[model samples]
Target chain A: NLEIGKSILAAGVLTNYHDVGEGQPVILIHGSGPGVSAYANWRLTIPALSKFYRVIAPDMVGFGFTDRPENYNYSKDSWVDHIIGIMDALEIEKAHIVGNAFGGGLAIATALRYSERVDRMVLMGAAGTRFDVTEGLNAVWGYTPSIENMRNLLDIFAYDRSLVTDELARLRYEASIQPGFQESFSSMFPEPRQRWIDALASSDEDIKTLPNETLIIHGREDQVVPLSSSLRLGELIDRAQLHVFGRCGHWTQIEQTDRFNRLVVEFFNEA
Target chain B: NLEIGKSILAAGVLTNYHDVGEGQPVILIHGSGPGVSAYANWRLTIPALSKFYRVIAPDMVGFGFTDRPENYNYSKDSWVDHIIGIMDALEIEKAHIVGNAFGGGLAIATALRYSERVDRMVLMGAAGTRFDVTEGLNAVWGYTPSIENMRNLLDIFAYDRSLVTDELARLRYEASIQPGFQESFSSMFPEPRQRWIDALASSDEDIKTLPNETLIIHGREDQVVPLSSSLRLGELIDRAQLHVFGRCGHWTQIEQTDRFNRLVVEFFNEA
Candidate 1:
């Protein structure tokens, strides 16, 4: 089974996750994708991150190896519970969070509801603000299991097309085809995916009242999520500092993984 | 005899209004109060405005001398229709709108639904954006009728205490106690007045894509609508320019009537 990250009961689901190194707890929440896994996103960048702090990245419930309850109802409440459950299971007193795209919304939700448990925050190409859904995001939701479809997705994700090699597409295409992976991916977000974007939004009041020292990162030319959302996020969050990477697209963390990792680590270390 | 502001059947209501002069149409929308009308808020300012354009100020549905339908239900849809119905009734090809407080929410909603009809927009202490409802708005909504309550209300409306003379309270007290006034006022926005704030809000997408030339006016020390809402408005509206007056409150139009009128006229006339 390629589904080989540790398993623990997180919010009633036997969750699969990567828990590596130790210091200040830094939980990583990955973006939504057809076959996105916690380990897959952070495989290259997290080694450097774990050297500085304990890294906790989980394949969220209904994705990767995590338990997908039959006819499981997905909602904002349940996702927040899954995140809180992880921190509870591991007995993490308090933690810093780094969120990528869809996970950024969950990170904001967690902070809004359970502000006491969250210490600091990082949002990369986040989707927690309101905006018109682009074709890129719609195409992402419309994804099905095919090698060509995965190839197109990689192009949409990256600014530099050369970064997406044949091997990566082959690997990702296989991940999409895995049993339960495609089923859950297709099940989670249906045809009317725009509502899902709004469903993930935290109110302006919540954004304004965020007490955590937050760092927001975005690509100037993001295709999946608009740059204006992060711009608004930076303005709303009192203690937030925004950084936009030029010549970058939706994969701000993946494309510019090293700087993204360093920036987050530095944010946590800033006394 | 004091209920003498011309009667016109606008949409479904027998709307009382003031229409004067000729040229391009300029509609004045007065704010929400226990017994506010189109005549009172723009009584002094409308004459100067009429010199250049056809000034049309109507008592909105469920308020002033406008018809309050029997067993009526208030919602975003009906309010929008009432505005469009006025334009259609008047045979106005296009209009420049000046909005005060709650009327600004109506102005934005009208523009959102019928973008072709709205030429320019002026939002003065506008309540079109999402924000937490303050104590003052709640107090205004919960208002019944008394001279003492009127005096207390005037203090919240004006930054200068001297402007709140005894004659003002007596006049307002009589207005609130009008035969059918309190009945409809209390019935419109019920106990949970907070929902009315959100009910008036335009979506972030709608605001972001506003096609009109917008002028946003706010008081730095507003006691009714928060200055933060206007601050967000300036940021969201693309072609928007905002003016914040010091030592001014919710009655920016009333307190600084001459300057407010001149500013709006300038916004319309400027090439």
Candidate 2:
């Protein structure tokens, strides 16, 4: 059984996360969804990576069991600072960062803002590039809390249809209905009719300045974040390597667990 | 020696192409380059595919040995109609399309607008999706008509530098300097500062409606047309399959000639 823990950061924010094993620090960041938590996205990854490192999977500021502050301003800069605050509370000076989807974008931002604190990075199906709106993204942001809608979103997130089980949908549905959960989620991805938000997207010129070694993994069949996003990132970043898995979806870490784990461990271990 | 032939279509456009072998028709479309022609781009591809199927490599309007009409409109719609006109002039009701770069966009357009005339499609380093400008593309369109610039463009097109031979550069340079070639080429891809012409980009909504079976091939390290273009196209078209070659660039038919031929042949032969 997995044990959940909580930590009060220097900023006085209550952060919920799962910490296991003992070695060099490795932080896991989860993506955004109606009911996404660090545990839900990184359950398989944390255990496998724990064998080689001390893995910390943290539910982000506005997600999971982490406290959602009243009238809190949610932006990319705020998210980056929250993760750094968590690292400070843990006394981690430098650590490896692994992120999926929106978490992947945050990892890149952290690397750019706090380069000395980041050892290396693994971005799986990362988001942050500017692109025409995709159908998968439209479906995700437009989702209202319901079992049927959650199931539909899960189906879109995965290449393997079997992964979208009824039990999984119910678990997410329960988490989604929590007070202020949907409100925070909707605030991050405003409707197209609302004023455009530029904070979520990173410019190519800025991405070229990242100095840390990076491994970009993406699914060939990803609908949520276009695989082109990773391809463009690879082109812009000087120290970046790209690995694409066939027949995979947005959930690369889940869909290709063993290979994804092996690749990340090997990349971090390389001199 | 592969002899080139010319045909005058009902639309009064003189089309130039290389027709070899005797079997089902497989049309080869070349990508955009300063001096690119069907012969320059598909020399290796035509013979290999010809052994199994009739290969038709056309110098699209305003390129290579093809006639360049003064004041001729150069746009995606015009290119699509020109190719269809060639098929009609040849008395062929349907044919398989193997397009690279610009030709890839044309193939998609053909399948979308004139589905009845298209049998199947193989898009290599296809360009139709919208993305921010890349360094490689910037260098290509920003090129001045000179041997040095042509050499630079060819170098960017391939992952293997040895492919940029002196003889190849000289040949392309000669073709690029032909009367009216630079004028029409410049018109199609204006400088980045100019207002963007949306005629080249195909909408995802329209691409989703295509009914032809598709085989999307791309080079993993392609600079001109990013690999993501092919990946997204694979997602949109229902019957589409994708094949990516590692250690390759935009010139897939040239850089990975043997594997590219096998994949196209195997895909077209499938029942």
Candidate 3:
């Protein structure tokens, strides 16, 4: 429960985030899910990384404590703008971006659209690469708002069941029931999904042009995003190295907390 | 450490294994590597499953504690026969087969060749599918036997570097330099490796005919065996399901000991 800060970005959008430590700027982008906050996704990672670098994890436009405009377009473009907006508002010219799952897609989009702003990138269980909708993706998008449903979703999000505590389920359940949270989640990840949702993902050709030295980290058992997604990204991105964790799920930071932090920090610190 | 057992099967072949607990027989077959033995692979798993079922982890003919015959054929068919030979020596008619990497391919081969003797199956990072050699596979086959080389190889084998302790590297290094180990390793995993090796894997069509309820477990980040290998196996095997661990590498049991044990035990216990 760290102190949460709000930055009023362009268009009067209030972005909620955690900003700590002092050094090179590192932006942490949270993935999309019920009750997800930048803090929720990066709580364990922020502090560990902050020791050597400034870490900023923001709640993307339609999720967490960030302002969720009723008419906001919850597509990839809007998310990328929202990220750039956060950086603009905070006066951060360039920062290392670390993204998880949906946030991974946002980071990639930002690197392509706002290349100068992204110094280095770390993609964990990223979802920008094109692939057929997997059962894991279906399970996430198909979820309903019951505690039982959230429990099941949490179970799917992690490889180790022990991490899916009662408190976690209750917290996420409360978040899911927040005003308009369900609508926002559905807008970004609609049911009856297509193989290629242009608004949500970037084409491989576009992704190939990302010039930053990127680090691809994924869970071997990520049900939400296919491991092949990262594998494909590794091949497409000219300067990229992929590290995969075994017995892990979509939530790499949470499940393998220390290692994820070390990998991201080391990647950021590299020459 | 559990007691290690050895059996002198027909034709003077000596098979080494760990036999413990008492109930439904569960034969644990290990993967391929310079120093991989049944004990090294299944030490943690064997004891945990022993409480629910009789667990038998054997060093396949060409690996670990098992006697390495210089002139012996190191093919998939030979491995299958050797496993059956172990079963025959113990007078066990049928058993649940749990295979890892090379052993996964062997398990699939055994089920296809001796369907009558297999109760159920669990393929962990199994290698029966058709795919090109990955960087991880190249690393494994390309290793030279220095302690530093063994450390690098062990590091590749696991997602968690903490598991790659000095003791483990020394132990594996010792095993790797054993008499005839290199000869056997090269014979099975020859250089200028083919896209698919007949001695190490089975075709998708052959795997499709396996008439048993199979559980496919893999590290989403398995460097040696691509996760697609298991995905393809799940699709081909009629009654197969895949469980992937995030942040996991090729060695599942060692990295996610408790969860891997639980998953395998529950899968075997299911009616």
Candidate 4:
């Protein structure tokens, strides 16, 4: 279908997910961007994680094939509810999490609120903290649905521009302008985007109280999210550890795939 | 020349090292094993690390080509002095340090005692914390001089058996039997190997007091050093972060070279 990689209904929202492999469960949450689907964001991630886990990568309520309901108010709580709903519908009591950008923030909020549902987590180029809205993030959230704009956004997302191609841009661009894609994406984060950053933040006290072990990952050159956010995250979470990739940008999963996968697998495997 | 890539005189000893590249200096200290030397431990490391920063990898006083003075005591203090002596000789006021196994121990001791000389550092498959001497480490230090034994040692050192070849074992066995090499190795850590673990340890207090940012990396299945040791080191060092590679044994630098190198480059780059 439309960037909508097929899936069973995970939540009541007709959630789409790539469920693969066996053994320990892991839910990989996709980030916020035009045409961002669980499949698109984590095509590389699923195979790797699936080898060691029953990987669940879901299109959130407002993303991909998941039915974005009418008059739906998008907020951290709304996303968290959707995530929990997925677990509930699938009979998964707990699973590890690997989150990127917007997915990263939800991962943190999930750890804080539903501690029993999370085992361990990796947050890459995650955004769940208060910081000045980055120009790159503004551009991502402000994507104008043109292939050229999609190409530019890809460049902003990845430190190595060579990884982004006109072909992929054309595909993502087409996906972004799908029947309900841009309509949901645009309203999710409007102009004056700094408030969105603030709204996603969990209280410092709540983060400090999280019991699950967390691995905070970020690319050194990430333009969409400040490195300071993870530095603060590492400091606030007692069991948290951090790794920053050099010459990498917001697309750490795509850029440092093998290394990132091995790291996450090992971190979660540390029993 | 003799398993020594090249060097400059440091610590008043006729030392051997591979000094290459330019920019912020980074000193690499190797581990302990028969036929062990800085070059063998860090040969794969230098090209990658040197590309970004000046890499100084030295054979400690009693190991490799460095002059092992008669009647000279080998201790953490002795090794740290040699390290500082390298910095002094090179006119490097401060530099990042990368330590491996025994070298990892020296890196921690250097940071605690000579914090001014170390800006940031990496510890991989390190052995600075107190833990039970693994059957793996005891086997390494207690090695008998035989190609067959070296073959066994190689097997213990790496998780993947395919990496340990008979030809390499023969060559490394030759290195171990070098005149004065086995003599020095046998005496450095005799029976009751647990004491050697304690000898390399820094106090929890000292590690807690360190000011430099530390990166603690380990192989999840390392036979030579228990993962718990690095776990303890991570907990003690306030600014420390950690990475563990799965299916990786003691040879993180060699087994997970690209990932380890990029991680280190990005870590020290955070000036």
Measured against the true structure, the TM-scores of the candidates, in listed sequence, are 0.51, 0.54, 0.55, 0.59
Write down the RMSD of all candidates, one decimal each. Answer: 15.9, 10.2, 10.5, 12.4
Candidate DockQ values, in order, are: 0.01, 0.04, 0.04, 0.09
Tell me the docking grade of candidate 4. Answer: incorrect
lDDT of 4 by residue, A167-224 (tens): 9899999989989889989888888988889999888888878887888898767898
Best by TM-score: 4
Model 3 lDDT per residue over A26-110, tens place: 9998877777888878878878998999888888887887788868766777778888888888899999998888888889989
lDDT of 1 by residue, B162-233 (tens): 999899999999999988999988887886878889999998888999978788888766888998898688
Which has the better lDDT: candidate 1, or candidate 2?
Answer: 1
CA shift at A40, candidate 3, in angstroms? 0.7
lDDT of 2 by residue, B1-271 (tens): 1324655552468887888887898888887877778887888887788888888888899887678887888778888988888888878789999888778888888888898989989888887767566788877776778788888999999889898988878877878877777877777688771223245668999988877877777777889877777778777777665666657888778776766776677677763
- Model 4: which residue pairs collide? B100-B104
Instruction: Give me the candidate number with maximum DockQ.
Output: 4
Shift in Å, residue A271, candidate 2: 4.1
What's the true lDDT of residue B206 in model 2?
91
Clashes in predicted model 3 = 16
Candidate 2 per-residue lDDT, tens place, A125-147, comes to: 88766766778888887778999
Error of 2 at A86 (Å): 1.0
Assess each prediction's global lDDT (C-alpha) against the native. 0.84, 0.80, 0.79, 0.84
